[PDB]
Structure 1
Amino acid sequence: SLPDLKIEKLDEGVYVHTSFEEVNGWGVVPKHGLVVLVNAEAYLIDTPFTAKDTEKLVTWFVERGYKIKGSISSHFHSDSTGGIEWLNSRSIPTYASELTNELLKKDGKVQATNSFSGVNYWLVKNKIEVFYPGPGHTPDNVVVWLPERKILFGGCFIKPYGLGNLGDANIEAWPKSAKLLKSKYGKAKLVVPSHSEVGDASLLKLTLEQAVKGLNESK
């Protein structure tokens, strides 16, 4: 059996949700995302793999008096977007980048209700910022920055030990994207990857090194 959904406090106003899935060819994969609290409102940063876990996650917060204001998905793969269909059915606003919605469409998946283009997008003014560093893990990957906490949710772009599945990756672009990310959020207090433990700004350097190595190995 898979472990259950976990929800744990990370910082004042920020929780990490971890879900688990058996992935063909990769084994059991943990997935971290965040929940961010602003007053009595909650924002989901990435959805769990399944509608079932998305509902569990939402219910956990609703029980504690929060209203679910929005969800943002970091990239098109299912481990960031699997709960979109369910959230949309409940009229909970969902957000994704234009590129993400286009990839969802092409992949036969329900799109986020709201989208944005460009490099910086403020989901919540002064509190939650979405940044696009360029193609890497996927063409559309974005990160989420909480300036009040200096916490960067790097999602599936942050790959400190190895790049993982390159099926949708842009190996030529990843190093330039990773350098841009590291120069932008080099002062991060915490960096939260999708598939490995929370770390400090060093995870940005390691991702860059891995991207550079991967490109070299590809040539």
Structure 2
Amino acid sequence: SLPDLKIEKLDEGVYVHTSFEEVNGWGVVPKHGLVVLVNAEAYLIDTPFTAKDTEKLVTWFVERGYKIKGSISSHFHSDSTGGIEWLNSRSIPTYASELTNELLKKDGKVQATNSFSGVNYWLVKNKIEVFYPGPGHTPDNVVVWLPERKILFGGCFIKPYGLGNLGDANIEAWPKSAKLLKSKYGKAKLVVPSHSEVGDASLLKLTLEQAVKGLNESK
């Protein structure tokens, strides 16, 4: 069996949601995402694994006075996109990069209703920024930046002690992409990985070291 969805406040207007699922061979695994409050409204940064936990997530904030304005997925794997079907069925706007949407369609998965492209996209100007560092954990992976808090949600790109599942990874590009990410957000106060503890900007340096190391290993 699986632990309940957890929601804990991380900072002002910023929550970490952790959901869990059973994976063959691994057992129970965790996945972190964020909910960001913009005034009277809430944005999901990644959905939980399932429809059912996305609804519990959504409900928790609706019940506390926050309309769900939208939801953005950092990449196509179902630890970021599992709730997109449910959200869409509720007319809650979902966002993903054009690259993410291709990879969802290609796997027979429901796509985000809205898409964006390129390096920098404002989901909410001056409050929620999406950045594309280049291929790494997946071809499509992006990170989300909360400039008012200097909080970076890094998703499954942020891999300080081992790169994780390499099946969709781009090992030759990841050092590049990690270097760009480090240069751009070295002033982050908090960096939030998908599968490990929140840390500071040093997670950016360790991820770059890991990607280099992974690229060295493959030879």
- SS of equivalent to 2:210: helix
Q: Distance in 1 between matches of 2:189 and 2:122?
A: 20
Structure 1: give runs of 5+ residues left out of the alignment.
Answer: none
Q: CA deviation at 1:28?
A: 1.4
| 1:76-125 Cα deviation digits (max 9, x unpaired) | 00000000000000000000000000000111100000001100000001
Q: CA deviation at 1:26?
A: 2.4
Q: Distance in 2 between matches of 1:67 and 1:73?
A: 18
Q: Distance in 2 between matches of 1:22 and 1:186?
A: 34
Q: CA deviation at 1:203?
A: 0.3
- SS of equivalent to 2:32: strand
Q: CA deviation at 1:37?
A: 0.2
Q: CA deviation at 1:24?
A: 1.8
- SS of equivalent to 1:85: helix
- SS of equivalent to 2:122: strand
Q: CA deviation at 1:51?
A: 0.2
Q: What TM-score do the two structures reach when normalised by structure 2?
A: 0.99
| 1:172-205 Cα deviation digits (max 9, x unpaired) | 0000000000000011000000000000000000
| 1:35-85 Cα deviation digits (max 9, x unpaired) | 000111000000000000000000000100110000000000000000000
Q: How many residues align?
A: 219
Q: Distance in 1 between matches of 2:45 and 2:87?
A: 13
Q: What's the % identity of the aligned pairs?
A: 100
Q: Distance in 1 between matches of 2:27 and 2:186?
A: 32
Q: Which runs of 4+ in 1 moved over 4 A?
A: none
Q: Distance in 1 between matches of 2:27 and 2:167?
A: 16
What's the C-alpha RMSD, in Å, of the aligned pairs?
0.5
